[PDB]
Design a protein around this motif. Sequence first.
Motif, PDB file in Angstrom:
ATOM      1  N   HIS A  81      33.153  84.274  60.751  1.00  0.00           N
ATOM      2  CA  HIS A  81      32.713  83.123  61.532  1.00  0.00           C
ATOM      3  C   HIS A  81      31.191  83.023  61.543  1.00  0.00           C
ATOM      4  CE1 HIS A  81      36.862  82.849  62.829  1.00  0.00           C
ATOM      5  NE2 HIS A  81      36.805  84.083  63.298  1.00  0.00           N
ATOM      6  N   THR A  82      30.566  83.623  60.528  1.00  0.00           N
ATOM      7  CA  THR A  82      29.103  83.732  60.410  1.00  0.00           C
ATOM      8  C   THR A  82      28.437  84.257  61.691  1.00  0.00           C
ATOM      9  OG1 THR A  82      28.802  81.322  60.744  1.00  0.00           O
ATOM     10  CG2 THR A  82      28.874  82.122  58.466  1.00  0.00           C
ATOM     11  N   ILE A  83      28.937  85.398  62.167  1.00  0.00           N
ATOM     12  CA  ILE A  83      28.391  86.090  63.338  1.00  0.00           C
ATOM     13  C   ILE A  83      27.024  86.691  62.999  1.00  0.00           C
ATOM     14  CG2 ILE A  83      28.855  87.804  65.153  1.00  0.00           C
ATOM     15  CD1 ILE A  83      31.861  87.635  64.202  1.00  0.00           C
ATOM     16  N   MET A  84      26.903  87.181  61.765  1.00  0.00           N
ATOM     17  CA  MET A  84      25.627  87.601  61.171  1.00  0.00           C
ATOM     18  C   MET A  84      25.067  88.906  61.738  1.00  0.00           C
ATOM     19  SD  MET A  84      24.178  85.195  58.763  1.00  0.00           S
ATOM     20  CE  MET A  84      24.795  86.692  58.007  1.00  0.00           C
ATOM     21  N   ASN A  85      25.842  89.976  61.601  1.00  0.00           N
ATOM     22  CA  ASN A  85      25.359  91.324  61.889  1.00  0.00           C
ATOM     23  C   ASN A  85      25.177  92.136  60.615  1.00  0.00           C
ATOM     24  OD1 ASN A  85      25.775  93.200  64.862  1.00  0.00           O
ATOM     25  ND2 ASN A  85      25.273  91.013  64.773  1.00  0.00           N
ATOM     26  N   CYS A  86      25.851  91.692  59.556  1.00  0.00           N
ATOM     27  CA  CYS A  86      25.831  92.347  58.251  1.00  0.00           C
ATOM     28  C   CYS A  86      24.458  92.293  57.578  1.00  0.00           C
ATOM     29  CB  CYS A  86      26.890  91.722  57.341  1.00  0.00           C
ATOM     30  SG  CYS A  86      26.868  89.910  57.309  1.00  0.00           S
ATOM     31  N   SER A 115      22.083  92.283  70.028  1.00  0.00           N
ATOM     32  CA  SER A 115      21.228  91.388  69.260  1.00  0.00           C
ATOM     33  C   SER A 115      21.486  89.937  69.651  1.00  0.00           C
ATOM     34  CB  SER A 115      21.432  91.596  67.756  1.00  0.00           C
ATOM     35  OG  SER A 115      22.790  91.427  67.392  1.00  0.00           O
ATOM     36  N   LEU A 116      20.467  89.098  69.470  1.00  0.00           N
ATOM     37  CA  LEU A 116      20.540  87.672  69.801  1.00  0.00           C
ATOM     38  C   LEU A 116      21.618  86.904  69.018  1.00  0.00           C
ATOM     39  CD1 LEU A 116      19.199  85.049  71.262  1.00  0.00           C
ATOM     40  CD2 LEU A 116      17.717  84.990  69.240  1.00  0.00           C
ATOM     41  N   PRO A 117      21.678  87.073  67.675  1.00  0.00           N
ATOM     42  CA  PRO A 117      22.691  86.344  66.906  1.00  0.00           C
ATOM     43  C   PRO A 117      24.122  86.687  67.318  1.00  0.00           C
ATOM     44  CG  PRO A 117      21.706  88.093  65.589  1.00  0.00           C
ATOM     45  CD  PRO A 117      20.847  87.918  66.796  1.00  0.00           C
ATOM     46  N   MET A 118      24.332  87.926  67.760  1.00  0.00           N
ATOM     47  CA  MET A 118      25.646  88.395  68.188  1.00  0.00           C
ATOM     48  C   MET A 118      25.991  87.866  69.578  1.00  0.00           C
ATOM     49  SD  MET A 118      27.412  92.161  68.255  1.00  0.00           S
ATOM     50  CE  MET A 118      25.833  93.005  68.094  1.00  0.00           C
TER      51      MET A 118
END
Lengths: 239, 613, 138, 102
Positions: free
Chosen positions: A208-213, C31-34
């Motif tokens: 879901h494009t969470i973007m931690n990777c 983190s902010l994005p999370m």
Amino acid sequence: PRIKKFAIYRWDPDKTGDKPHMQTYEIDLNNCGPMVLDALIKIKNEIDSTLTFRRSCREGICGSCAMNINGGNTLACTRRIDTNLDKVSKIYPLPHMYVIKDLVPDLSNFYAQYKSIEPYLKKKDESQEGKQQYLQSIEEREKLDGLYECILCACCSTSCPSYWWNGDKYLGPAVLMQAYRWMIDSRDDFTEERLAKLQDPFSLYRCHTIMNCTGTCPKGLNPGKAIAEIKKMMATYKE
Amino acid sequence: STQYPVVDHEFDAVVVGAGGAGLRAAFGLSEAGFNTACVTKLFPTRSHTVAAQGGINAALGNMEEDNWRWHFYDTVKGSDWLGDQDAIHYMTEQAPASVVELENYGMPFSRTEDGKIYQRAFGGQSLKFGKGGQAHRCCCVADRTGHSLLHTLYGRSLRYDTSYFVEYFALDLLMENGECRGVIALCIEDGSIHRIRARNTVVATGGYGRTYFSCTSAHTSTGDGTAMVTRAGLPCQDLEFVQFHPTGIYGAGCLITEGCRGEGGILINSQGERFMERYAPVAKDLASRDVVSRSMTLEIREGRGCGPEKDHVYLQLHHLPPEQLAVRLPGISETAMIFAGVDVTKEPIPVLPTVHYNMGGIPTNYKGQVLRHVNGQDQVVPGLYACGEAACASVHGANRLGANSLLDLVVFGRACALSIAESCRPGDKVPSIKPNAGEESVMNLDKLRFANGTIRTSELRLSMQKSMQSHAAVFRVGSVLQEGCEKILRLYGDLQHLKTFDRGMVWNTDLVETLELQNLMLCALQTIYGAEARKESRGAHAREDFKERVDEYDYSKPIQGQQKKPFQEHWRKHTLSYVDVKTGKVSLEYRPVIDKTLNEADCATVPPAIRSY
Amino acid sequence: TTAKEEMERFWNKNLGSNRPLSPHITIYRWSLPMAMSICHRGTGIALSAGVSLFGLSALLLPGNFESHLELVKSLCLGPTLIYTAKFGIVFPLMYHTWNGIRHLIWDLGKGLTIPQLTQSGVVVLILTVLSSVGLAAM
Amino acid sequence: SSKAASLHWTGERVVSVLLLGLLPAAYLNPCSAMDYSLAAALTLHGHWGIGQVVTDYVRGDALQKAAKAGLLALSAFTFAGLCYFNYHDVGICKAVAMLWKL
Ligand SMILES: *Cc1cc2c(cc1C)nc1c(=O)[nH]c(=O)nc-1n2C[C@H](O)[C@H](O)[C@H](O)COP(=O)(O)OP(=O)(O)OC[C@H]1O[C@@H](n2cnc3c(N)ncnc32)[C@H](O)[C@@H]1O
Ligand code: HEM
Ligand SMILES: Cc1ccccc1C(=O)Nc1cccc(OC(C)C)c1
Ligand code: SF4
Ligand code: F3S
Ligand code: FES
């Protein structure tokens, strides 16, 4: 004299009833290398030879020393000890993963997923191969940049929230980025059927494009970006 | 006894090691239709061919136009005539055939205007038989070549029905009456002892660079197959020959590629002079490794060193265009930014000549068969093969050429496959082993697990490492070598005094590093004693007391009126060493160098000549 | 062995063993994005819970909407206490609306670098407060 | 070979550009025809939202269908109610209007 504190996740599978606890170690930074791997080796070599971890290159091109240091998943030989003396550095094994022994996680599923995406050049002819070199222009070669460098450290997928809950059926960024890597290779002929491998809601569509990777990649690569490109190819491709 | 679960497996062929050579030998067998097993202590990607940066040599002629017969002359020259010319012939001709094989597997080689594999200049390679200037034949995946090499092999390996014992530390070889039956191995996961029997066994365990305090090699470069062979009473070739790579970071010893010097990088001392001009006029800074590292180390003796300790040297990259520095060398751009903290485009890299490649290892036929020495003559060891760094067909000789190892990997890996596919058939009778065999491999393992001594494992390791680093280095003399020998010998007796702390089964790294130690010491003892025994200057092994190239003749003057020396008088021969496991005393003999080629007509023999660049 | 055969063996070993799962969110860095993705789910759920409570109440509960409003009117509602009850409905909506565009931009492929993710993350967070306060006063 | 997860993924984004388009379209152009198209986009986009939530957290096989079945009930009931509200009451445009201006 200059001392630093390290809190490490410990679990021995030999002693029954031994539940996972924390153990502290203190080491002088003038006698130690800048990196976290240097510290782990030092307490392994001097203080306690019961600490277990995967290590090899100490160069940051294996994925052996991949762990969770200070809340993030990077390599121990790449990331350096915070010279801040009063603060204790917390070291854990990669998140939501079965632990074989302290700091050493089971990656059997992770490796098997990389197998299932078929990471090799596939052609229509296997008869005319081996004898002549395939042609590839510099621009077609440039599309592989930022993708071939992936070392399979598994800092990537172990940071993905979707990969935690859905470790079984969802492939995860690292694996997916490689699947993409073989798609844009001009030499590869099996691009359309590589996309057909992901026509279920789990394989690709748990992202879901969470973007931690991307925000954890030790090598600076952008797997999340690549996933979106797969999604784009999935809705556009012909037949 | 009775403590460990003895688990037996049945196979056609076993491959020990899953890096490069081992990996290539593995799937090449399954390609032929063999029930192949592959035993490895690391996950195949975590192997050490991944660390490779420079590239892989092949005479494709994409830059200008090349001839593989020139690639022969250059390797046979750089070998300082210790190189077996039958192996070099086979490797140089198979070179384009093995590389085009890799590109067709999917190796993302850097590209040119034509769309062909990008080659580039490297240490000591020349056109028109060392007459037509600098040669550009090092194929490379832009600075991360061995990474792509290992990945594209492994990727292509899942296309076959090979069995992989991931994280299985191979203890000893299975042996019955001079013949190899396979390997006994320890599972690192559960701790059970596995015996894997087969008709054949390929050994690709890599080098033993961890014998020294300072090295570029990974922590798992412990020359285990080299030890396995010596515990079987089989010989070990050219062990004293140890490559010192000129460019390695002052810290932990991280490798900066020789591709730096190949692209346009220049090597600078404290005064500011390009010190690779008075030492080497023609080839200069892109000369052979035994000339560059020889110069750098000797420049420190003068007091012309650099830094607060006056021990390291600098490598210039500041002058290079950022245009190609970020393209051709981005892997060293990142890794020199970390350990050194040096801006690769503006500031020069701190370098140091450190241990790198192991020229010697296990005596190997040009077809990959392991050789032993019986009555001055050669003899094939039945059911045993070796390819790669652990192998010593001595295609590299006294000094290995720049980026010639990854070739030695693929070519001889393939050779090990073909020679099994030609000699025997798959499904042929797998020789039966005694139910009692692997008896004292368990006893060795069990004592190291229960060890209740006085001397710590890590403290005995560093004792070996510093004793090797100081005594047998770039320059060595009979005074310092003699002391080092009896220093290491007395240390081998200290192995029965060691203390282990882990009394567990699952992932006992405390135990496997001690098994790494036993496998390192044996590799150390033969290296040090071999260095003392050899009293000449040939390639990497440099003697300050015997700075002489001792061949059959003096090859500076024309050989006509000269009378030939007998075999036990000159030094142009391979060092074969054995070790008694109990006493530790090294007994060593010698065998002749192969000077004949495969086909004289297609590729002529190159006789010994002047040694300089 | 095949690919998906190795996966079968992975679970049939670990599930029937004494191996513990490594701490995931128990220790993982915030983190902010999370946090912004967690919020996007929470807002999504909260809104659908509201809309479903509006649809269900339209069928199940009797009495027209004008009568329901006069029930609210006759509660001597506060001056700012009505604004707060209003604001707390715009805030979840406007966050999910603006960030909905940010997710949609990623679908095209734009703004997927680390700096662009952090920049547009604040931009969404800011543009929300403006559209929330702005509408609750409208 | 059929590509179900491919076309479904596109659909979610199509209603997303519709739903984003409709919110200013409801303000600037408030009508009876707008009320129904809004209720459809609201309930559909919501149904394809929780559907994704279920496939994520809900672990199981027999459990998986039950939540999806129950979700379809609420989705249908929500859309039925919002349609009923647009026909036999004021309408969702005026519902917000009378809620906001009053
Ligand atoms: C050290 C080094 C070498 C190197 C290089 C950079 C560095 C830092 N760059 C090179 C380059 O750019 N171009 C080139 O041609 N060569 C370069 N080299 C040299 C070359 O890479 C090495 O010779 C090569 O890596 C050797 O490979 P080999 O096939 O011999 O095997 P390995 O990579 O060393 O890995 C060892 C494998 O053996 C298994 N093993 C070892 N012991 C055991 C036991 N006890 N039990 C079970 N398995 C064992 C390991 O699992 C591993 O896979
Ligand atoms: C018009 C502005 C809106 C846009 C552009 C939009 C778009 C989106 C997007 C892009 C997602 C996440 C899908 C993804 O990329 O992974 C999402 C999630 C969701 N949306 Fe909206 N949305 C809007 C408003 C609404 C409204 C009014 C509702 C009604 C209740 C709603 C209900 C939901 C639900 C329940 C989710 C859950 C999906 C998830 O978080 O995994 N949204 N929306
Ligand atoms: C699956 C998913 C899709 C979209 C948005 C969020 C999630 C999700 O569950 N993440 C999650 C759930 C719980 C905790 C957590 O960590 C915090 C402690 C930072 C992250
Ligand atoms: S893409 Fe980066 S973070 Fe992911 S596995 Fe590869 S090296 Fe690790
Ligand atoms: S952490 Fe995640 S859900 Fe997608 S963007 Fe990366 S795989
Ligand atoms: S050990 Fe190779 S990555 Fe750290």
